[PDB]
Design a protein around this nucleic acid. Sequence first.
RNA 1: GUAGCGAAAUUCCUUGUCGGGUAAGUUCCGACCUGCACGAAUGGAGUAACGAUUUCCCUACUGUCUCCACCAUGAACUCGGUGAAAUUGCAUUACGAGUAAAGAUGCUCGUUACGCGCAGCAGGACGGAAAGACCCCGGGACCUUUACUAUAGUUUGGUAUUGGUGAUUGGGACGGUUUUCUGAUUGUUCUGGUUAUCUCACUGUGGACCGUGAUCCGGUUCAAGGACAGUGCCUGAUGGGUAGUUUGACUGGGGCGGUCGCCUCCUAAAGGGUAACGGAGGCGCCCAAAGGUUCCCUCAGCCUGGUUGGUAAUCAGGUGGUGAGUGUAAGUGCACAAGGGGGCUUGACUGUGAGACUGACAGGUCGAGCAGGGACGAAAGUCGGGACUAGUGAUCUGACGGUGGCUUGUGGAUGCGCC
RNA 2: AAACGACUGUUUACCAAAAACACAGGUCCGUGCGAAGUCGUAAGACGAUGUAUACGGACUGACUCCUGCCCGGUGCUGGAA
RNA 3: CCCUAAACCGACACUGGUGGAUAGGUAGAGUAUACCGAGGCGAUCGAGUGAAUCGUGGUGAAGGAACUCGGCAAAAUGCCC
RNA 4: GGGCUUAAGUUAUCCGCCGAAGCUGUGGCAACCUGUGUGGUUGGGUAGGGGAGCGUCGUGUCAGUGGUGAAGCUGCCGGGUGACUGUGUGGUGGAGUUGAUGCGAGUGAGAAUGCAGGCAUGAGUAGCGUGUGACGGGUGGGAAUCCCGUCCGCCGAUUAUCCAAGGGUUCCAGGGUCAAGUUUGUCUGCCCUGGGUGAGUCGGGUCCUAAGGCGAGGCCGACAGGCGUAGUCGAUGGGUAAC
RNA 5: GUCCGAACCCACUUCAGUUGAAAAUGGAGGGGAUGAGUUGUGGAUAGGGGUGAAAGGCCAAUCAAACACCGUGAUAGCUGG
RNA 6: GGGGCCUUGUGGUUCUGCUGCCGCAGGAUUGGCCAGUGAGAAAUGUUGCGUGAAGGUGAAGCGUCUGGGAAGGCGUACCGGAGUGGGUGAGAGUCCUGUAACUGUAAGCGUGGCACUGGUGUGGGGUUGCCCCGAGUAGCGUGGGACUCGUGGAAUUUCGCGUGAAUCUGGCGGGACCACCCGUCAAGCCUAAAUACUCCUUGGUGACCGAUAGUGGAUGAGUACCGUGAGGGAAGGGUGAAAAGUACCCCGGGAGGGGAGUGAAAGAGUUCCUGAAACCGGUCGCAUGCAAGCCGUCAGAGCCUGUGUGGUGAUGGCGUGCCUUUUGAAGAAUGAGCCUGCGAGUUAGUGAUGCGUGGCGAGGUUAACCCGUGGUGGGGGAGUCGUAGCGAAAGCGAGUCCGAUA
RNA 7: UGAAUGUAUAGGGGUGUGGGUGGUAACGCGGGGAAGUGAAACAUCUUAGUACCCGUAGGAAGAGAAAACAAGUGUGAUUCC
Lengths: 67, 96
Amino acid sequence: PKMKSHSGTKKRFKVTGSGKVTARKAGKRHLNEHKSSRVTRRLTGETVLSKGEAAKVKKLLAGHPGR
Amino acid sequence: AGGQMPIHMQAPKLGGFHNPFRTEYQVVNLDKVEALFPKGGKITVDDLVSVGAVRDNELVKVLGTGELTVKVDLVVDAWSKSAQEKIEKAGGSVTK
RNA sequence: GUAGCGAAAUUCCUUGUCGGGUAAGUUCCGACCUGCACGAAUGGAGUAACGAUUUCCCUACUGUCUCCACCAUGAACUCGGUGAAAUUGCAUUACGAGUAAAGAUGCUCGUUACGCGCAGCAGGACGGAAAGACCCCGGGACCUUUACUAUAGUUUGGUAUUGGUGAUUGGGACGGUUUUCUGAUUGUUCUGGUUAUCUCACUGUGGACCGUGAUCCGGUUCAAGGACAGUGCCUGAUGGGUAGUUUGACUGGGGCGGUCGCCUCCUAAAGGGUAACGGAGGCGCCCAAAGGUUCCCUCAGCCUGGUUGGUAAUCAGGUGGUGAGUGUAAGUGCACAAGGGGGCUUGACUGUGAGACUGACAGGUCGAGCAGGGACGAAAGUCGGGACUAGUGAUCUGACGGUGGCUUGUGGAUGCGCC
RNA sequence: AAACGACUGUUUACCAAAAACACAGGUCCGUGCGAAGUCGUAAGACGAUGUAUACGGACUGACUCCUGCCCGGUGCUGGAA
RNA sequence: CCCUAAACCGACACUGGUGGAUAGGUAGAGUAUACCGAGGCGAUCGAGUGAAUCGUGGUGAAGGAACUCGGCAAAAUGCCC
RNA sequence: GGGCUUAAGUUAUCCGCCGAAGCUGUGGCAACCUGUGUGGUUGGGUAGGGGAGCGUCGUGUCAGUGGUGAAGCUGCCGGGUGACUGUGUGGUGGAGUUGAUGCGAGUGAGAAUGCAGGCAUGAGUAGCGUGUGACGGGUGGGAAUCCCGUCCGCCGAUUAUCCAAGGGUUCCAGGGUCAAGUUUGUCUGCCCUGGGUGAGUCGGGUCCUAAGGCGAGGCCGACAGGCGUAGUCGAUGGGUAAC
RNA sequence: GUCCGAACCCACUUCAGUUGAAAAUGGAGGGGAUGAGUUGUGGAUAGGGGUGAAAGGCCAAUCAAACACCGUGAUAGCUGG
RNA sequence: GGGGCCUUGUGGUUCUGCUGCCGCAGGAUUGGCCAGUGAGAAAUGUUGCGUGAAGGUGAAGCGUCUGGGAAGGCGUACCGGAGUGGGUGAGAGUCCUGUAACUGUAAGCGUGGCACUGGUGUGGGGUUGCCCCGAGUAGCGUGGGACUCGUGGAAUUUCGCGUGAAUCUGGCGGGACCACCCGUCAAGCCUAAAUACUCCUUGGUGACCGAUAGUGGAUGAGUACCGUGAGGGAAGGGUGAAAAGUACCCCGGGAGGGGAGUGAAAGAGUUCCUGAAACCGGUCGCAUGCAAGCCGUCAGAGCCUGUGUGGUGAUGGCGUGCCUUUUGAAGAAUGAGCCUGCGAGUUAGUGAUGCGUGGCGAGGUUAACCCGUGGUGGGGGAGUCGUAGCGAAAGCGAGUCCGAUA
RNA sequence: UGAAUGUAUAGGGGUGUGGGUGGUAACGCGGGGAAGUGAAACAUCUUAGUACCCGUAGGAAGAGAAAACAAGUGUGAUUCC
Ligand SMILES: [Mg+2]
Ligand SMILES: [Mg+2]
Ligand SMILES: [Mg+2]
Ligand SMILES: [Mg+2]
Ligand SMILES: [Mg+2]
Ligand SMILES: [Mg+2]
Ligand SMILES: [Mg+2]
Ligand SMILES: [Mg+2]
Ligand SMILES: [Mg+2]
Ligand SMILES: [Mg+2]
Ligand SMILES: [Mg+2]
Ligand SMILES: [Mg+2]
Ligand SMILES: [Mg+2]
Ligand SMILES: [Mg+2]
Ligand SMILES: [Mg+2]
Ligand SMILES: [Mg+2]
Ligand SMILES: [Mg+2]
Ligand SMILES: [Mg+2]
Ligand SMILES: [Mg+2]
Ligand SMILES: [Mg+2]
Ligand SMILES: [Mg+2]
Ligand SMILES: [Mg+2]
Ligand SMILES: [Mg+2]
Ligand SMILES: [Mg+2]
Ligand SMILES: [Mg+2]
Ligand SMILES: [Mg+2]
Ligand SMILES: [Mg+2]
Ligand SMILES: [Mg+2]
Ligand SMILES: [Mg+2]
Ligand SMILES: [Mg+2]
Ligand SMILES: [Mg+2]
Ligand SMILES: [Mg+2]
Ligand SMILES: [Mg+2]
Ligand SMILES: [Mg+2]
Ligand SMILES: [Mg+2]
Ligand SMILES: [Mg+2]
Ligand SMILES: [Mg+2]
Ligand SMILES: [Mg+2]
Ligand SMILES: [Mg+2]
Ligand SMILES: [Mg+2]
Ligand SMILES: [Mg+2]
Ligand SMILES: [Mg+2]
Ligand SMILES: [Mg+2]
Ligand SMILES: [Mg+2]
Ligand SMILES: [Mg+2]
Ligand SMILES: [Mg+2]
Ligand SMILES: [Mg+2]
Ligand SMILES: [Mg+2]
Ligand SMILES: [Mg+2]
Ligand SMILES: [Mg+2]
Ligand SMILES: [Mg+2]
Ligand SMILES: [Mg+2]
Ligand SMILES: [Mg+2]
Ligand SMILES: [Mg+2]
Ligand SMILES: [Mg+2]
Ligand SMILES: [Mg+2]
Ligand SMILES: [Mg+2]
Ligand SMILES: [Mg+2]
Ligand SMILES: [Mg+2]
Ligand SMILES: [Mg+2]
Ligand SMILES: [Mg+2]
Ligand SMILES: [Mg+2]
Ligand SMILES: [Mg+2]
Ligand SMILES: [Mg+2]
Ligand SMILES: [Mg+2]
Ligand SMILES: [Mg+2]
Ligand SMILES: [Mg+2]
Ligand SMILES: [Mg+2]
Ligand SMILES: [Mg+2]
Ligand SMILES: [Mg+2]
Ligand SMILES: [Mg+2]
Ligand SMILES: [Mg+2]
Ligand SMILES: [Mg+2]
Ligand SMILES: [Mg+2]
Ligand SMILES: [Mg+2]
Ligand SMILES: [Mg+2]
Ligand SMILES: [Mg+2]
Ligand SMILES: [Mg+2]
Ligand SMILES: [Mg+2]
Ligand SMILES: [Mg+2]
Ligand SMILES: [Mg+2]
Ligand SMILES: [Mg+2]
Ligand SMILES: [Mg+2]
Ligand SMILES: [Mg+2]
Ligand SMILES: [Mg+2]
Ligand SMILES: [Mg+2]
Ligand SMILES: [Mg+2]
Ligand SMILES: [Mg+2]
Ligand SMILES: [Mg+2]
Ligand SMILES: [Mg+2]
Ligand SMILES: [Mg+2]
Ligand SMILES: [Mg+2]
Ligand SMILES: [Mg+2]
Ligand SMILES: [Mg+2]
Ligand SMILES: [Mg+2]
Ligand SMILES: [Mg+2]
Ligand SMILES: [Mg+2]
Ligand SMILES: [Mg+2]
Ligand SMILES: [Mg+2]
Ligand SMILES: [Mg+2]
Ligand SMILES: [Mg+2]
Ligand SMILES: [Mg+2]
Ligand SMILES: [Mg+2]
Ligand SMILES: [Mg+2]
Ligand SMILES: [Mg+2]
Ligand SMILES: [Mg+2]
Ligand SMILES: [Mg+2]
Ligand SMILES: [Mg+2]
Ligand SMILES: [Mg+2]
Ligand SMILES: [Mg+2]
Ligand SMILES: [Mg+2]
Ligand SMILES: [Mg+2]
Ligand SMILES: [Mg+2]
Ligand SMILES: [Mg+2]
Ligand SMILES: [Mg+2]
Ligand SMILES: [Mg+2]
Ligand SMILES: [Mg+2]
Ligand SMILES: [Mg+2]
Ligand SMILES: [Mg+2]
Ligand SMILES: [Mg+2]
Ligand SMILES: [Mg+2]
Ligand SMILES: [Mg+2]
Ligand SMILES: [Mg+2]
Ligand SMILES: [Mg+2]
Ligand SMILES: [Mg+2]
Ligand SMILES: [Mg+2]
Ligand SMILES: [Mg+2]
Ligand SMILES: [Mg+2]
Ligand SMILES: [Mg+2]
Ligand SMILES: [Mg+2]
Ligand SMILES: [Mg+2]
Ligand SMILES: [Mg+2]
Ligand SMILES: [Mg+2]
Ligand SMILES: [Mg+2]
Ligand SMILES: [Mg+2]
Ligand SMILES: [Mg+2]
Ligand SMILES: [Mg+2]
Ligand SMILES: [Mg+2]
Ligand SMILES: [Mg+2]
Ligand SMILES: [Mg+2]
Ligand SMILES: [Mg+2]
Ligand SMILES: [Mg+2]
Ligand SMILES: [Mg+2]
Ligand SMILES: [Mg+2]
Ligand SMILES: [Mg+2]
Ligand SMILES: [Mg+2]
Ligand SMILES: [Mg+2]
Ligand SMILES: [Mg+2]
Ligand SMILES: [Mg+2]
Ligand SMILES: [Mg+2]
Ligand SMILES: [Mg+2]
Ligand SMILES: [Mg+2]
Ligand SMILES: [Mg+2]
Ligand SMILES: [Mg+2]
Ligand SMILES: [Mg+2]
Ligand SMILES: [Mg+2]
Ligand SMILES: [Mg+2]
Ligand SMILES: [Mg+2]
Ligand SMILES: [Mg+2]
Ligand SMILES: [Mg+2]
Ligand SMILES: [Mg+2]
Ligand SMILES: [Mg+2]
Ligand SMILES: [Mg+2]
Ligand SMILES: [Mg+2]
């Protein structure tokens, strides 16, 4: 049978043109008042995963190209 | 992950949405057009770019990375501004 | 906490104390009350009779014993027949003092010992038999309850079954008395609450009759109820009656106690890092100034003089470099002040981030330069909160504001996305 | 002679026969009969071919003398501004 | 045909369990017990041998619970008038 | 440990030797690096990673081979760095199977208190299930254990006799001694063959009902089903004619 | 629901057995033995249920939820191989 | 849309009543386009085909050699629309059974199809005044279920309980809802084929098993046996080509053996092919009764043998099992009495992701299915991956996104 | 024929007209409907509408001739791949 892809991984991770795995930075959904604009700038970007985490995400995606 | 909140839970969900009616433009470049129609392709068409390679039964947008030293009449579905500018500079045209 | 009872089937201390019994009595039985922690239908205190119940004593009686002996028998033992069992890494399987996974037939150093049988005894082979029940850890089961979430049942009201006619009580329709109105209303319709009636709805019932010569059942009828009850659906309450489950870890075993994230110091062995239920403390804030900027100032202590006034309030002179101070722990800092004061302000900005620091990662931290638009300063310039480092919470889901990217035939709407 | 249970009985087949259970007696609560209670989805049935001197539940446990104070908590019963 | 069993229930040709009927004599209250009757059996490995020891019985000087957690077991008592 | 001071004790110092799978010499194997004439470095190893193989079975193809003896089994003589092996040589055996090269695996066992069978160990050991047998004669290949007889002992509210339940041919006669019988056995409740059970009255049915079961219709229940009327069964009882 | 005591029913003590004669018995005593007695035959109650003079006892020789089959090759961060 | 209202049209008529002495309908052998045993508003005899169940025919070899036996060897011929097998005393194309090919089928309830009989039967155009078009239904509310959708922005669909419509200028659907547009006409019914399956029947097949395997079952197998019952549930295959199964004699009561016969073989004698290991013995060689032994190993005398290598081994040195699990085990931690057999990394996906290798290459590749009853081959490009990325997306595009066209 | 009873029905008496009963390996349709398991606990969810069960077929069944899709043209019953 076909292998299903992981739903959370589908919704959370992207794969770039060069095979890099990127996610959205965590920690900016709420409780933003005490955070400086510098902290929000650090948390508003797009993070590139480490090699091990990227391999795990690629295993979780059943060939799904990411969101 | 051993009980630690796993990456696929700690990372925030990329939100957004998908366009239900999004169409994807098969793209051909001026490098490829020049290479596959070197003898000054007079009137290239969707069928001609398909017999070369455009993956037919799709819209056949033409993009403009290249030089296009020849004169060519593209007759395709949509084109980029730089591609159009290069085409009229070389002396060709686009249609549709 | 009464009557009564009490070192008791209850008394920890405890062999309480006294008295009886014995030559000697932690037991006994009668008392004391100092009841750790009696007590009146989970009955209190008694009680003739009863007890293969528990306890103490006397007598009789005895191999229970001093202290065993002897006799006969079923096994044991020899011969003939028949003929298992658990167990089993191995074998030509000594002792001593050692050594080693800390208890050796098997290793070391020594000592002793001819080969093989038979009857015996149980010190060892950590002997055999049962993948320890005790303990802990994982799972399960059943039990309990004011654990959680449900549920049968019981119960509430609505509504359907469900109709007829009334009164007695509230809200309008509605005009046309009042006085559209603070206040009164009536009639003409409409709609709630409550309540009493009526009866080929219904009740599964009391009598009679018939199916039938049947204590079932049904039908007819009478009586009694009666739109109630019953039942369906919806709904609130109740519900260990029942069901599924949860009930953390660390820990010099576990339990109890304590602890769990963040910050500072020491341990920490002069980079960084470094554990213990190691040694000390803090944090879950605060401040519209205690932020920004610009200019100005120097403290604490000590000595002397001085109304109230004293060690110490305010004042003067002298001395005094950090020992004062710092919103808040501690350290590193800060007198060039980052400490004290005045002026003007909102940078406690928007768009950014070269380049680095630090973590397994999520992440945490610093940051030049630039644009916009400001504050302060004559300018140089400084300003993306606070001398620095704690004052915090990923994701999910939902919410508000803005934006308008998307919207399933189109236009809206609605929903979503983005910030 | 003391403790316990009044007694005869009953009980852990296969480690406990007892001071445990039962018991006669006692009290409280429920039940007006299609009873309450119980089995069952229901019809039915037991209760009972019984009718409050009965039936069901609870605790106590022959007999003698007795059974005190507390309704704040919880439960039950009644009441409904 | 077996049938208070070698034939049934116990895996056995198993010192266990299995309902009913008949059931004489003497001693005796007796269907207890002893020895016998009607009738039936000698039991399904034997032969020996004074070992220790274990089981099962027997007797015991003087003492008489000194035993032991405890008079456990045994002994004594026992019937009729 | 023996023993040692007459050091074989301590200490300073000198001269020798012993001593490892270390080093060196010699011979073989292997991995890697290197310019590729040389040479250099390396080769303990659990978990584990990489590489290259042995053996078994099936199978495509080619070459074959086999009663002048395949497979299997079992000796001897050999071979390889290993799993293993000989195209050496016998024995047993009686119908298949070898080499090359591919292909496919139910492809390798010493452990799982593993499963099945066979067989050891304990061991000629414990036991042979309450007891009283003795003798004379007989039978027989064989007799404590079979038959007959005589003594003796045992049971006798049962070790007797007859039923029910249950069993099912064990009953009788004759033949038998592999197995079974806790020994032996000529014997048997065993084996083999044949035979044996006679009812108007006995015990049941043809008669009766109890508890209880089933239950025409029926009532109840989503279905499945529950209950129950009329009935109809059901002895452990009633009724019923022989000694 | 008297007394002593056989049958009968029981199971208090002790010894033996404990690879037993026996997966609970045997020897010696012991309790009840006209009663809430005991026993034969047939029947009824069934597994979250039965029944229980109540021990969580018993329900076909292991019952804090029987047995058989099925879901099923349940699952096991554990032990073994 | 239909009914109605009309302008016409019914198969050529014997020539009946009614509507108007117009027309309508019954009528009757006869055409007849047709249509038929089907779901089709229906269902009743005679004639044309190859066959299934049984059968029939079915080609073509001898001679020598060794052997118990020829299918083997050697020589030499034949058949083949037949060389697929399986038998026969060993390995057969021509010995047997068959096979190829052809043929028969009477019969079937036969069956399938055809002809005949026989049975059944037209519309087109206009019109809209009117009439009809499936009701406790659709909807709505509520409590549940199914839809990717787990109550939600909740369409569509469904059950219980309430409530309850329009009906053509109408109803429903197009994911709340409304409008328009597009589609469609629910609340009546029947419908072959492609699809699923095998207790059975017939034929065939297997890099499937070969008696601990394969069914539990190659045999009295759901049997023996166990359980009250539901239920559980085995083990045991092989003489030889042919019984020619050992006449007769001897020891023995027999059992068993010894002679002899049968047979190629009897050490193939029925417990019978082959006959391994554990295990149990006889014989021979050496060692062993002064010795402390994880049982071996290295050194090594003597003896035996010499089939000149082998067997044995006095005596000396060194030396604490295997596995598991462990910081650490000879361990007095676990498991194993012994041998033989059996017993654990598999398989399936046009799964995911690497690598090796082969093909093709800016292209690669098919899936279902169709053809090949002749297979493993050919077709099939629907799809799918590569061919452009960036963005939540509109979109833009070698750029894009955040941003101010920074 | 017609009860109570008036209509009449229930019922009763004929007649025998037709059908039913039960079995069956898989496949079908309609309905009822687990748990172990997974989620490293667990309750939503999962397992799974699976196991099992009830009713009921046929040689196949079910479905089926648009109150359908589509999205601007169009497709034209259902089933299956
Ligand atoms: Mg947000
Ligand atoms: Mg902010
Ligand atoms: Mg956590
Ligand atoms: Mg005292
Ligand atoms: Mg005390
Ligand atoms: Mg005293
Ligand atoms: Mg009181
Ligand atoms: Mg009280
Ligand atoms: Mg008390
Ligand atoms: Mg009392
Ligand atoms: Mg008292
Ligand atoms: Mg008393
Ligand atoms: Mg007693
Ligand atoms: Mg005395
Ligand atoms: Mg003896
Ligand atoms: Mg002997
Ligand atoms: Mg030590
Ligand atoms: Mg020692
Ligand atoms: Mg030693
Ligand atoms: Mg040794
Ligand atoms: Mg000995
Ligand atoms: Mg001995
Ligand atoms: Mg010992
Ligand atoms: Mg032990
Ligand atoms: Mg134990
Ligand atoms: Mg254990
Ligand atoms: Mg246990
Ligand atoms: Mg639990
Ligand atoms: Mg249990
Ligand atoms: Mg109600
Ligand atoms: Mg109501
Ligand atoms: Mg009234
Ligand atoms: Mg009335
Ligand atoms: Mg009235
Ligand atoms: Mg409870
Ligand atoms: Mg509970
Ligand atoms: Mg669970
Ligand atoms: Mg835990
Ligand atoms: Mg502790
Ligand atoms: Mg712990
Ligand atoms: Mg440091
Ligand atoms: Mg350091
Ligand atoms: Mg550390
Ligand atoms: Mg300052
Ligand atoms: Mg702020
Ligand atoms: Mg940077
Ligand atoms: Mg920090
Ligand atoms: Mg600026
Ligand atoms: Mg200025
Ligand atoms: Mg500050
Ligand atoms: Mg400041
Ligand atoms: Mg979550
Ligand atoms: Mg659409
Ligand atoms: Mg922003
Ligand atoms: Mg007293
Ligand atoms: Mg006392
Ligand atoms: Mg008593
Ligand atoms: Mg009493
Ligand atoms: Mg008593
Ligand atoms: Mg009893
Ligand atoms: Mg007992
Ligand atoms: Mg009473
Ligand atoms: Mg009632
Ligand atoms: Mg009654
Ligand atoms: Mg009491
Ligand atoms: Mg009160
Ligand atoms: Mg009170
Ligand atoms: Mg109240
Ligand atoms: Mg008898
Ligand atoms: Mg017996
Ligand atoms: Mg028997
Ligand atoms: Mg007498
Ligand atoms: Mg007697
Ligand atoms: Mg006699
Ligand atoms: Mg007899
Ligand atoms: Mg016997
Ligand atoms: Mg002797
Ligand atoms: Mg005596
Ligand atoms: Mg004497
Ligand atoms: Mg004496
Ligand atoms: Mg005397
Ligand atoms: Mg005396
Ligand atoms: Mg004493
Ligand atoms: Mg003493
Ligand atoms: Mg005594
Ligand atoms: Mg005595
Ligand atoms: Mg050396
Ligand atoms: Mg070396
Ligand atoms: Mg060397
Ligand atoms: Mg190596
Ligand atoms: Mg080395
Ligand atoms: Mg390894
Ligand atoms: Mg040959
Ligand atoms: Mg072979
Ligand atoms: Mg090969
Ligand atoms: Mg294998
Ligand atoms: Mg083996
Ligand atoms: Mg075995
Ligand atoms: Mg032996
Ligand atoms: Mg002997
Ligand atoms: Mg012995
Ligand atoms: Mg002996
Ligand atoms: Mg003996
Ligand atoms: Mg005897
Ligand atoms: Mg005898
Ligand atoms: Mg005799
Ligand atoms: Mg006698
Ligand atoms: Mg007598
Ligand atoms: Mg008979
Ligand atoms: Mg016979
Ligand atoms: Mg027999
Ligand atoms: Mg006989
Ligand atoms: Mg014998
Ligand atoms: Mg005989
Ligand atoms: Mg005989
Ligand atoms: Mg009769
Ligand atoms: Mg009856
Ligand atoms: Mg019926
Ligand atoms: Mg009768
Ligand atoms: Mg009868
Ligand atoms: Mg009495
Ligand atoms: Mg009896
Ligand atoms: Mg006892
Ligand atoms: Mg004992
Ligand atoms: Mg008495
Ligand atoms: Mg019964
Ligand atoms: Mg208890
Ligand atoms: Mg039992
Ligand atoms: Mg349970
Ligand atoms: Mg499952
Ligand atoms: Mg498992
Ligand atoms: Mg273990
Ligand atoms: Mg022929
Ligand atoms: Mg030939
Ligand atoms: Mg319609
Ligand atoms: Mg709708
Ligand atoms: Mg709804
Ligand atoms: Mg759903
Ligand atoms: Mg709806
Ligand atoms: Mg729409
Ligand atoms: Mg249909
Ligand atoms: Mg088999
Ligand atoms: Mg074999
Ligand atoms: Mg076998
Ligand atoms: Mg049976
Ligand atoms: Mg031959
Ligand atoms: Mg042979
Ligand atoms: Mg054999
Ligand atoms: Mg053989
Ligand atoms: Mg010697
Ligand atoms: Mg030694
Ligand atoms: Mg350890
Ligand atoms: Mg060991
Ligand atoms: Mg050992
Ligand atoms: Mg262990
Ligand atoms: Mg072991
Ligand atoms: Mg084994
Ligand atoms: Mg395409
Ligand atoms: Mg049928
Ligand atoms: Mg669950
Ligand atoms: Mg779970
Ligand atoms: Mg788990
Ligand atoms: Mg159909
Ligand atoms: Mg059509």
